[PDB]
Write a protein that binds this ligand. Structure first.
Ligand SMILES: NCCCNCCCCCS
Ligand SMILES: NCCCNCCCCCS
Ligand SMILES: [K+]
Ligand SMILES: [K+]
Ligand code: NA
Ligand code: NA
Ligand SMILES: [Zn+2]
Ligand SMILES: [Zn+2]
Lengths: 341, 341
């Protein structure tokens, strides 16, 4: 299978992340992509290609235009306002606030943010567009008849909602890929989010859409980031009724339990009639992940890839999270081995 | 007039504030109270007394119980979770989130926060209770027949809403004072917020209540903190209809303009029939204030106090903001001179 990857991911190289009341080097750092690329090549997936660039045609169908405009100039405005650090939101539009959009940079960065750990830094927008491009080109391979492809996206996407960034995410790459598949002729597409964290951004984008089914397996939001979405009761609204399936799970969950939710999610996706599945792949479900509480082992990723591919429908694998250790690469590569085997 | 002041304000001595993407020493630091106290004594207001302690009777009528329980244990829980810095929220319940309350400390601190610049530190709860006590004792003086009193509150209160802390505020002292006056027999009370920033917390607490009228003069929230409340169109709802009056004003506003809004607010308060006015006094309207854009001069504070007192109705002055410069003390003292003159 082809691997789509842009060297322009490195334009996002933020210096700070707000974690535990401290500003620390970010977990979502350029070396993650280096580790993953090296491991997938070592596993034999060496057909690596840069994406063609893309404009905003596809992404405007899943993200708000004001949001994208804000990201395009956020860093410049932050710097012009005289702030000394990176661009980090402080005030947020929480319960019982006005729905109005501020005009200034401090107000706007909060208006457009869901989580303050994520700083905007110079090059962030450009990196996000490159990552989106990798997702688009991956989708195009699936549309053209390939049964699998891997978009090595960085920065990741699944916490970015219609008009919010956060969780290290700015453009929802998986959502853009799903939209691209619909634009190329699909009528029904599923997104299956296996990252440890709920894909709250993806859920937001498709919650009221009946053309996309969203399934997520994740740490229970009662006690895990992103904290404010991902409960099982959330099944969709309006045109999207019945097209969100959340599988929250608790501390220590191993594959023997996690795989049961996987089986069920795939049943749901099959009943929906998805023509392809965009897999939002994070490997922060690993038993050594520094910020997560699941207990998957490296061999479990092979099982996971094989099971998702036994759907018999084409897969686009889109990179999301997985942190801390170079074994994130082995784990990603193992999912691909399961898909290709 | 009597000045109520607790030395226990000093138990709030946080190390950090998130400002401009950096963790810096807080603007709202113990020296503020020292400076203000010294200046009011210098102006002849030397009848200074400590508040009696108070439990939660009064405050439970303006703040949510879950919120107060959260504040009481937040520091302990944050430390027990192993975080190394002070307690700073990251995820927030923004647009289109679940209304559910998280169980863990990271989820809860965001659930109960409106602004991430404000860290919870050891002693914060105890300090907030002492500041609340100063407000309650001030209210009791008014209830007993005094026409003026000054509660030198620290930490301040007006950004704390029903179930949210932020803007350096944890317990809404002015809201507690208003409630105490109602509990002592008043039927109608007004809160007049002259701090540069909108009292979004106070507005939240009384938005649907007809027994309290809230007026605020402030920097336009389209460009100024708190960013997400304080527009003129917000006039109240339900039983509270017509009991919020917001006067947003722009960059460079001097007393000649600000005083016209003051006059109008007092007309509204008189028409409401307030039996007393709780003045949320911030002096960050000063032309030198480091974080604000109004252009009041030190003499204007005397005019302001005199005009508010010309209402002919008893006043409780409750300390809010005012930062940076040594003149914060002179400016507060000048309001008291205007009231007492
Ligand atoms: N203490 C837990 C901090 C979690 N903060 C954000 C993690 C985002 C990963 C996205 S895949
Ligand atoms: N760049 C403006 C930072 C504003 N941050 C909060 C100020 C709170 C004052 C309360 S009286
Ligand atoms: K997930
Ligand atoms: K105000
Ligand atoms: Na949907
Ligand atoms: Na009211
Ligand atoms: Zn993740
Ligand atoms: Zn203020």
């Amino acid at each position: 299978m082809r691997v789509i990857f842009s060297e322009d991911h490195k334009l996002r190289n933020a210096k700070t992340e707000l974690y535990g009341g401290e500003l620390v080097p970010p977990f979502e750092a350029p070396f993650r992509a280096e580790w993953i690329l090296a491991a997938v090549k070592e596993a034999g997936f060496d057909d690596v290609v840069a994406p063609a660039r893309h404009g905003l045609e596809t992404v405007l169908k899943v993200h708000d235009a004001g949001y994208l405009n804000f990201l395009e100039t956020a860093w410049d405005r932050w710097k012009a306002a005289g702030y000394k650090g990176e661009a980090i939101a402080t005030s947020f539009p929480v319960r019982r606030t006005s729905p109005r959009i501020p005009t200034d940079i401090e107000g706007q960065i909060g208006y457009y943010c869901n989580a303050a750990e994520t700083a905007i830094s110079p090059g962030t927008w450009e990196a996000a567009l490159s990552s989106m491009a990798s997702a688009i080109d991956g989708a195009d391979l699936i549309a053209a008849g390939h049964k699998a492809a891997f978009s090595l996206c960085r920065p990741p996407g699944h916490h970015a909602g219609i008009d919010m960034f956060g969780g290290y995410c700015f453009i929802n790459n998986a959502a853009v890929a799903a939209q691209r598949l619909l634009d190329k002729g699909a009528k029904k597409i599923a997104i299956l989010d296996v990252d440890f964290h709920h894909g709250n951004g993806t859920q937001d984008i498709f919650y009221e859409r009946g053309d996309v089914f969203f399934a997520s397996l994740h740490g229970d939001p009662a006690e895990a980031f992103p904290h404010f979405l991902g409960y099982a009761e959330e099944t969709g609204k309006g045109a999207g009724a019945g097209t969100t399936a959340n599988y929250p799970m608790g501390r220590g969950t191993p594959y023997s339990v996690w795989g049961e939710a996987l089986t069920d999610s795939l049943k749901r996706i099959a009943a929906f009639g998805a023509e392809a599945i965009v897999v939002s792949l994070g490997v922060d479900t690993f038993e050594q992940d520094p910020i997560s509480f699941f207990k998957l082992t490296s061999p479990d990723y092979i099982t996971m890839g094989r099971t998702i591919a036994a759907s018999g429908v084409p897969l686009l694998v889109v990179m999301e999270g997985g942190y801390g250790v170079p074994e994130i690469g082995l784990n990603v590569a193992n999912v691909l081995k399961g898909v290709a085997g």
